[PDB]
Structure formats: C-alpha cells, structure tokens
Paper text:
Collagen IV is an essential structural protein in all metazoans. It provides a scaffold for the assembly of basement membranes, a specialized form of extracellular matrix, which anchors and signals cells and provides microscale tensile strength. Scaffolds are composed of α-chains that coassemble into triple-helical protomers of distinct chain compositions, which in turn oligomerize into supramolecular scaffolds. We solved the crystal structure of the NC1 hexamer, determined the chain composition of protomers, and found that Drosophila adapted an evolutionarily unique mechanism of scaffold assembly that requires divalent cations.
We used Drosophila pellet to extract and purify endogenous NC1 hexamer as described in Experimental procedures. Collectively, Drosophila collagen IV does form the hexamer, which contains both Cg25c and Vkg chains; and the Vkg “tail” sequence (not found in mammals) is not an integral part of the NC1 hexamer. Isolation of endogenous NC1 hexamer from Drosophila pellet showed the presence of both Cg25c and Vkg chains. We were able to obtain diffracting crystals of tissue-extracted NC1 hexamer (at 2.98 Å resolution) and CVC trimer (at 1.75 Å resolution) and solved their atomic structures. We solved the crystal structures of tissue-extracted and recombinant NC1 hexamers and found that the tissue-extracted complex is indeed a heterotrimer of the same composition as the recombinant CVC single-chain construct. RMSD of superimposed recombinant and tissue-extracted structures of Drosophila NC1 hexamer is 0.43 Å between 1346 pruned atom pairs (across all 1351 pairs: 0.47 Å). A slight difference between CVC hexamer and tissue-extracted hexamer might be due to extra linkers and FLAG-tag sequences in CVC and sulfilimine cross-links in tissue-extracted hexamer. Out of 12 chloride ions found at the hexamer interface in mammals only four were found in Drosophila. Only Cg25c chains were found to contain chloride ions, while Vkg chains contain water molecules instead. In the solved crystal structures, we indeed observed four pairs of double salt bridges from R76(1626) of each Cg25c to either E173(1723) of Cg25c or E175(1685) of Vkg.
Numbering used by the authors:
A (entry chain E): 3 to 227
B (entry chain F), F (entry chain C): 2 to 227
C (entry chain D), D (entry chain B): 3 to 228
E (entry chain A): 5 to 227
C-alpha cells in the first residue's frame, strides 16, 4: 500500500469514524489555522496538518534574533473548527475545560488511493465518476476571513473544502490568554447555487435568515478504486 | 493500478480545451484565479481542479456571519479570472459581453503524477529521465492586483506555467455589478531569464518594451511519468 | 513506482543526497517566499517547488498592462532558508552569499511521504506500516517584517526541519543583490506541551540560550512500506 | 478674529446647532472616511473635512497613469456617521432615498479661540479648565475598524473624539453600488472607565451591553473666552 | 503666528502671498514607506515641506543599540511635477525635474480649505478671502493598499494643478526615483448631474474631460 | 488676544515633566504612542494633548460591535507606550512593575503657536526669526512594531522632536494580560544626518553601532513665537 492519508472532521465533541477502505492512524482536534504577527496562515482541512493530537489555545511560540523565545507572552491567535454547541447567552469568551464543548474532533485515515472533492454549484449532491467510491457528502466551504489579518482558505479539490454540516460560524478563534470565542469579524464563505441560466446575469442581492440549503452548493468527497 | 491523480489545463482562449493523451475528461469550466472576499484574496492554484469552475459568475460565493445570517451580493466583493486573447475594451464589459474575456479549462484524470520544470533560460527545459512532456509555455509565478489582491502558484504545479505569455493575463469582475474590466493596478510576475548571469551576480535594471518581453521570460515543460 | 517526489533541505552549504533507493531529479537552493509588489507568495518547503535550481536575488520579472516590463526597478525582495553560519554585521553581497543559502534536493519515492508532529519534547513514532526518514523540529510560521511572511502545512515535510535555528531564513534585496538578516525576523515553532493538561491556560514562558530547544515540539517525516 | 473652525455632528437626521458664541458657516452630512484600494483613510470628526455639503455613497473617483478615470466602476467604499434609525428586520442593505434616515447631519462653526476635548476616563463629566467655556459633552470615541482595510481614528484632543451620543455602531458603510449597511466586521473603540486604583491592575474581562455606558469614558469639548 | 504651507507642483520654489513672511523652503514630501509601513505627512502642514532632499532621509534603528542606513528596501514618496515621464528610473541629479518644491509662510489668521463637490469653485465663508483655487485631492495609492490621504479641511486636500499621477516613488537604498503603473490617485467627484441618494452613475472618463469631473476647492484665510 | 494653544511635553523618564515659564499646567499623565485594536494601529501624535492620558492601563479602550454588545479585555489587543530610561528586563514586567517603564507627560497652555524645526545634520537647527526656543532634541519620525503595528509623528509637531535619543523608545503592553515587554520587532525611525552628502547623492549603506549613533541622527528644536 502507498498510504495516502486524509483528515475527517466531525464538527462535534465526539471523534468521527474513518470511511470505508481506510485505516485509522490517530485522532485529535480540528486545527483550522494560526494568526501570528497579524498574519493568518491556515491548515488544509483535508490534510493531516488540520488534525492535532493535543489541543491548546496557543500551540506555538515566537523566537527572535537575540536567541530568546516568548510563549504566550504577547497577543497571537489560533483557529479551530467549532462544534454546534451554543455559546452562553452571556456571550463572554469560553475558558477552562468548558472549551471541550466547542472544539471539533478529527481523525487521520490512510488509504491506497487518492481523495478528491467535487462541487455541484447547485442543490443536487453530485455523484462521483466511474471508478470512484463515495465516502461522505457535505457543503462547499471556500474560506473564512478575519479583520486586518487576512483569512484562511481551503482548496476546492481538497476534502477540507467539503464540510459535512453547514455552519454560519464554522471556525472559532483562540488567544494566548487561554480562551476562545466567536468574534463579529469572523466570516465564512461558501460556494453559492448557480443555475445554468444564471451564469452571466448580474447577481441579485439576497439576505438569508433561514432555509440555507437553497443557496448553498453541495459537495462530495471520493476515493479512487 | 490507478491511484487517482487529477490534472487541470487552462486554454487561455474562448474555446474549451481537450485532455491530452489517453486521459479521461472529468469536467470543463472557466478559469478562476482568486476570490477577493472581505478584502482578502484567496487563490485557487491554476494546476488544481479548484481553479476550474464549471458554472461562471462574477460572484460565485456568498458570505455568512453572526446570528446565522448569510448574504449574497450584499457588499463589495470581487473575483478575478484568467483572460483570453480578446482585445482590451474601453469600458467595463457587462453580463454576456464578459464571456469572450474568460478563459476555459478542463480537468482530467492521469495514471501517474504530473509536475512542472522550469529552466530559467530562453531554452525550453527537457523533462527528467523517464518523464514525458505534455505542453510548453512561459513560467508564471505570482500576480498582484488592486488592494490586497494577489497570489501565486507553486513551482511544482502545472499552474506555475501557462502556454501563452500575456502582460494582462487576468481580469477583475465587480461582484455585485456583474461587470469586468482591466485596471492599471494589475501586475504579472514571471520567472526571469538567468542565462546572462551567474548565480550570485547583482541583477541589472532593465526596461523591456513591446515585443521584447517574450525573450526575457523563462520557459518550462509540464511532465508526467509513463 | 508511482512518481511521488520528496524534497529535503540541508540547512547548510552542502547539497544533500537522497536516502536509500530514491532517485535524484534535481538539486538547488531553498526558496522560502517572494515579496513582489508588497505581496508575499510562499513555497511549500516540503514540496519540489521550494527547491529551485538557479539562485538569484530577483529571479522574477514585473510586467504591467501597457506592454512594458521592468526588471530590478523597484524594491521587491526574495527569501531563502539560511544555514547555521554566523550572522554578519552588514549585508553580504555577491559571492559571500553562498555561505548563507541552504541547499536542497528532490527525490522520487515509491510510496507517500508525510510529517507527523508530537507537540512534545519526544520524537513521534511513525504509524503502523510506516518507517521514519528523518527527525526534527516543528516549523510552523515565519515573518520578516510587519505581517509579511508565511507558514507551512503541518502534513508537508517542510513543517519538519532537522536543525532548529531561531532565524532560519535570510532576506535578499533583489535590485541591489544584497542579502542580510534583520531584527524584525521572527520564527514560529510548535510548543512543547509535556507539562500541560489538555484544556489548561497556557503557561507563559520566556526561554533563553540553549533551553529554547527544550521547548520546541519534535516531529518525524515518515514514509509507508508497500 | 483669527477664526478657528470646528465641526459638530447631531448623529440624527436633524441638523445640529452651533454652540454659544460661534457662527455657522455651512451644514452638511457627517463623513467619517473613505476606503479606496482596500485602504481606509479617515476624516477628523472635529474638522470641516468631516462635513460634506452633498451626500453620495461614492464621493470620489480613481485615476490611473493612462490618463483615464473610473467612477463607481470598481469596488470602493465610503464611511459616514449614522443615525439611531433601526435597520429593517430583513437586514438588507439600504438604498434609495431611505438613506436619508441613516446618514447623520453636521454643521461647521467658526469661533475666535481654539477648541479642545478633555476625557475623564470615568463616569464623571470633566470640567473645563480655567478660562474655558463648555460647549457640549459626550462619550470618548477613539476609532473604528473594518476587516482587512485597517480603520479610521480620532485624535483625543479634537472635538471629533467626543460624540454626544454613544453608539455601538456609529459608522455605516456605503458602496459604489449606491447602498449602505452595517457589516459584522465594523467595530467601534471607546475609552474605558479606569479608576485610579486600577491603573496597574490586570484588566478584568467584561462583556457589557449597549446601555451599560458605565464603562464608557465621558468627555467634554471646551472653547476659550478672554 | 499661524503657518501656511504651499507646494509649487513644479521645479520652481513658490513664494508667500502679500504680507506672509517666509520661514523656510524645501521639498514636497508625501509619505515614507519604512519597514512595509506608510507614514504620511499633511500636505497642508509644514511637516510635508522638508529642507534637505534625499531618496532615504531616515535612519532605521533597532533594539540592540545598532542602526542601519540604506540597509533594506524602504522607499520615499514626493510630490512630482508636470515633466515628461521617463522609461527607466531617474538617478543622481536629473531627478530634480520630478520633485516639487514648497515653502512655509506665516499668516495672521487661520487658513482652511473648502470644497464644492461641483465643477464650480466654492466661495469662501463670510469674513474669509481666498488664497488660491484648485482640485480636491483626497487619497493616493502606490502599490497594493500602500498610500494615504488628505484631510479635507487642510489646504493639502486642495492642489492647484491636477495630474492623475501627482507623486513619484524613490527607491532609497538604490537612490533611484521612478513612476509605476500601479500608482492611482483619488479625487472628489463632480456631483452636479447626480440625483440625491441615488446610486452613482458609473463613468469611464478619458483625456481632457477628466478635469470636468473633479471637485473644485479654494484655500481661504480670515480677516 | 489669547487664543488657547496647548503643548505636550514628554519627559521620557519616571518623573513628571514641568511646564515652561509662564505656562498654565492643565494636566499630567502617561505617554501613549498608539493602540492596536482589532489589529489596526491608531496613533496619537506625541505633540498633541491626546498622547498624554492621565490614567494608565494596558488596555484603556473597549470595543463595541453588532447586536448592541460591547467588550472590554475580551480579545487579543495590545497598547504601545513611550518608555523611560529604566533597564530593559529579560521578561515581561507585571502590573505595578510597569510604572517604572512608562514615560510621563504634561499638557500646558501657551500664548503663541508652537512648531518644530529639523536640521537633518549634527547641528541644532535655529528657530525662525522672531521665535523663541523651548527645548532641543533628536528628530523622531516614525516607528514599526509587531504585525500591522506602526505609526509616525508629524514633522512640524513637537512629537517629532524628543529630548533624549533612544534606540528603544516604546514598549508593548499585552492588553488583557496586563504585562508589558520589549520585542525585536520594534523599530524606531529618525531623520538622518545629511551633512556628508549632497541632496541628490545615492545613499551609501552604513551600519552604525554604539556611541556613534547619536552623530548620525538629525537634530531638532521646539520653538514658539514671541
Ligand atoms: Ca472592499
Ligand atoms: Ca490580533
Ligand atoms: Cl458583494
Ligand atoms: Cl525590483
Ligand atoms: Cl533602505
Ligand atoms: Cl483584549
């Protein structure tokens, strides 16, 4: 076996399962990216780089030219996929072991073939072509943006661009102080539904409050035979 | 046995390209460079299937925020797409007129892996021993546009080398307005021709003019194992 | 053999060699990222794209819209993985730069290659069916000045460097062809979580001198047996 | 008289009045700043530059080096002080003449002396110094930030840093498309209440609501007499 | 003892009006790009008028008691003139044809700048007399989002001569100044043909018609 | 004929500075450089009274957003303050320890206007004819710190002229944690000594060390009209 690996995110506090014809290497926490020195570098949610075995609000440290290193001494951030657990009505940052309720879990699975992701740009879940086996389906996740640090994006062919559950706020921000929370500048971008007749028409404005699947593109990840 | 590698080629023309050799065509579409959402540029590598979007739109994405609210064409986002060889217009083209300015692409399946090699000289580099050539062109590295607009392709990806050399290889589409146009803030970056220099010599300032540009760009070849 | 490519960086002036029965494809210099038009485009240190055969302080050409290009006509910069040599007091120029540029090599491997991280002072063990290729320290992100910089994919071998240096890269002014280190350069490595509980508040620590290596997370680059 | 001038903003659809012993030059609309090419440059809310006689969602145009100018052809923004009018429950951007309800009004007043602003950093309204006359009181407004374009700030001695009414969202964002709305990344910063004993104590985390002005510093603008 | 600053936008040094006393002259500085950060100078304030010219008139100092001059890629930006744009960066002495000159004067009363947002020159308020007229200069960018803007009350937001590229970029370490295609300027628009609170009517203007769409302004001083 | 001019002086020491002869002291406080809220740096000019805040805090501001919610010390913002002449520590100072590192300032009232003149040479520039001198120092222009941290002083403002020359004139305070420290990403910019060059000469690279730095810094003087 050649051993191509990928990652799967449950978007919940419980560990997901590896799909068919894949073996579990290790399980961990869904890492989305890091914001150091006001620069947001993201991890591909399809690769193993998005699945850390241990969770912490500050998983790294800075080291300057005077041969000293500072850990959690200044203000840097980390990014993690979040669960559907509602934040408390006090809408205060979560700290301590209550952070368990909000950090998604993940697994890293090895298989003999490669993994791709297909996006339909419509309401129909696309089927994979001949010779490919379906593992899971979801919604087309493009990127997430923060204020004045840029953002973190997913490659549309990586399985990380196909989240099994749609979330208006799929990513949570954690600080070196040891707390995580949602912040208003955190936005999420998804592929929209585009009919064949809408390909060259001026887009019409629409603010959705509910019934989101009518405007969210469907996706499917598949392995090869 | 086939492991499942996918390759993507962009025609840079109004016609949809066809897959090379005995590779099975998976889908066709339009060449997407990057999306500028909330003044952040997120790119799709031109050698990745994500850069080939089957259904076009000046705003193929929508944003979601707090209080479980999503918005489509509700702000000031823009998109950038690879161009064709059409004539540069005088004003932003509208709706159906933009189709003649958007490049077409195709995504295929390959049995073995595919990479790209660069010579950094005027000569086209040869594939490594055991690898066959697919197409040749000019080494395309990164790009810069208006505001925080920018991005680039990985040097091992086939997207790092486009066939034609173009001083204006991408176009900016106003998302909510549905119009596209070229602007002077657009800048293309190509790998340089280093045949007249030694690896540690100081670069000499050069102003290249009409027609002289193709001679200063590095050549390339995209290769696959047979 | 499928045709999978592994990339190794020496972090020294010597060119590294491929392990076991891995076939060399090309060698070169370790490229980190390019600063073109005030935009940073990074290369995956674990991918062949970060290994460029020809070195130059400005291996790119800037072309605009009006069919005119400019080479070494602005303030664009290049960034390369440095070595373990002593940092000078003034920018080095011309040939003395070779003692500050890391070397790399691209090989072909039978199976897939990844990098696993421990987040602790212990070297992580490769999974069942995998054998380790080399070990090192978890290299996450890097910045040169302001927010200009980049980061590594924690699956790619580029996130795992064998030798740990607080300033693992060097900045080269392209137009004047000079390379130098600066005090604003900062590196970011995964932390050692050996004395922590999973959801505790991070214990802030200011580490100095040789103890810094004791607080860096360890990693190992593994390849699977077929 | 030397004639130092200042600006006053009603933060409502009604035009404010010039205070005592000052003369009204003109009235207009409260301009907070502009976001061109993903850069937010702000106007001081105390100067006349923050009081435009005519309102529009796009008050400027871009002009490149080819001697052409584009107006509202691409995606740039403008910023205006907003009224207390609630946005519709459909939470869709406001366009048309309904924009009258959301754009604040302003006046520019000339006086014989200079105008300063004092901030108390507490809940007590600060008194004007000896020889100074009180014009109006308010809340310490520091700056406002947007996503990936920076922000617009106020000088703490300018009367523009002293808004007469506290607003969680005092600034509204308008686009070249002809619409305005609040967007989640829009934040507002205010000076907090700091007791003398808390000057060097670790700040305590606290999420207040809007009405809880007990954490917002009070301010007072003052002119001089004779 | 209030100070006014005027920029010639040409190679000639400007002179103070009427009984305004000269304090010093110099070169028109727009902003500096040090360590990938843009710090602007108020074009209407004396700070934008620097006596000595240099492509890098600043010194970069760090933490370890060591400074560096012309040791990185910092650049400087100056108000240019109406001279012909070259094909390569200008160097050494011939660059002076691309640097505007300025002067600082003393005025008795306060000086401001009023804008009309129309093709008409705005009238100074009651009790004010005009010093010069011009065009509403709002913002400017060189590359990406690097640039700056002017306060619309300061006289710096009112330039006498209108050019689409009113500044030049000087590489400090290499000592060369040049123009670039990414440079864009932003001027207040002429709103005489617009309907109030309507969506702006997009326009692509070329050649001599551009001046007809620029807002006019006047720099006024009180008696 | 008194117009009401306000001046700001920074001692750069642990002692509070005093007003000049016949100046009415208005208030004293601590020297604030800029606040980094939501990764945007908003500065207060050191020559404006807004840079002198009487009550200190590592986070003297709070942010408000959508849904009428305000937050104090709820994220990852930092503040930057002018430092004193105390010895630089090895670790971040805590709470009360910060008082010996924060510069003191004073805001007074002056009868006539106050500006600053720079010579760009080792010689102290002369005040204009008719203007009296207040103090002399070294031309301080701009500064850069971590991330988007930065800012600068107006060249005519008294903040562009500091008495003491300091290679490390400001300190970074972690907002929510309440600790301050110096970092290598901090950089100060001073006007250069151009006596040994001609106004149009190409700058020569120079690395100035120890005591020789004071000779390469431009001198300045803060003047008032008599
Ligand atoms: Ca924008
Ligand atoms: Ca931050
Ligand atoms: Cl939009
Ligand atoms: Cl260059
Ligand atoms: Cl420099
Ligand atoms: Cl905070």
């Amino acid at each position: 076996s050649r051993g191509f690996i990928f990652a799967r995110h449950s978007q919940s506090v419980h560990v997901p399962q590896c799909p068919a014809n894949t073996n579990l290497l290790w399980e961990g926490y869904s890492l989305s990216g890091n914001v150091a020195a006001s620069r947001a570098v993201g991890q591909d949610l399809g690769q193993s780089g998005s699945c850390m075995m241990r969770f912490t609000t500050m998983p790294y440290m800075l080291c300057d030219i005077t041969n000293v290193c500072h850990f959690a001494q200044n203000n840097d951030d980390s990014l993690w996929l979040s669960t559907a657990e509602p934040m408390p009505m006090t809408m205060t940052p979560i700290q301590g072991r209550d952070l368990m309720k909000y950090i998604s879990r993940c697994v890293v699975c090895e298989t003999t073939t490669r993994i791709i992701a297909l996006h339909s740009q419509s309401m129909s879940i696309p089927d994979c072509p001949g010779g490919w086996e379906e593992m899971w389906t979801g919604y087309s996740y493009f990127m997430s943006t923060l204020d004045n640090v840029g953002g973190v994006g997913q490659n549309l062919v990586s399985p990380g661009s196909c989240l099994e559950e749609f979330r208006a706020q799929p990513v949570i921000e954690c600080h070196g102080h040891g707390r995580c929370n949602y912040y208003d500048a955190l936005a999420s971008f998804w592929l929209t539904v585009i009919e064949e007749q809408d390909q060259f028409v001026q887009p019409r404005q629409q603010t959705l409050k509910a019934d989101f699947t009518s405007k969210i593109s469907r996706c499917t990840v598949c392995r090869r035979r | 046995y086939l492991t499942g590698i996918l390759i993507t080629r962009h025609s840079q023309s109004e016609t949809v390209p066809a897959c090379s050799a005995g590779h099975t065509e998976l889908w066709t579409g339009y060449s997407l460079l990057y999306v500028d959402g909330n003044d952040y540029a997120h790119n799709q590598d031109l050698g990745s299937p994500g850069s080939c979007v089957p259904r076009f739109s000046t705003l193929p994405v929508l944003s979601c925020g707090q209080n479980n609210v999503c918005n489509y064409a509700s702000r000031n986002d823009k998109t950038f797409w690879l161009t064709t060889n059409a004539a540069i217009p005088m004003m932003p083209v509208e709706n159906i007129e933009i189709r003649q300015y958007i490049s077409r692409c195709v995504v295929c399946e390959a049995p073995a892996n595919v990479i790209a090699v660069h010579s950094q000289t005027i000569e086209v580099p040869d594939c490594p021993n055991g690898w066959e050539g697919l197409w040749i062109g000019y080494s395309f590295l990164m790009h810069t546009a208006v505001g925080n607009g920018g991005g680039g392709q990985a040097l091992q990806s086939p997207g790092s080398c486009l066939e034609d050399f173009r001083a204006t290889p991408f176009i900016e589409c106003n998302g909510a307005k549905g119009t596209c146009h070229f602007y002077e803030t657009m800048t293309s970056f190509w790998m340089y021709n280093l045949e007249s220099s030694q690896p540690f010599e100081r670069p000499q300032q050069q102003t290249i003019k009409a027609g002289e540009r193709q001679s200063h760009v590095s050549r390339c070849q995209v290769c696959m194992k047979n």
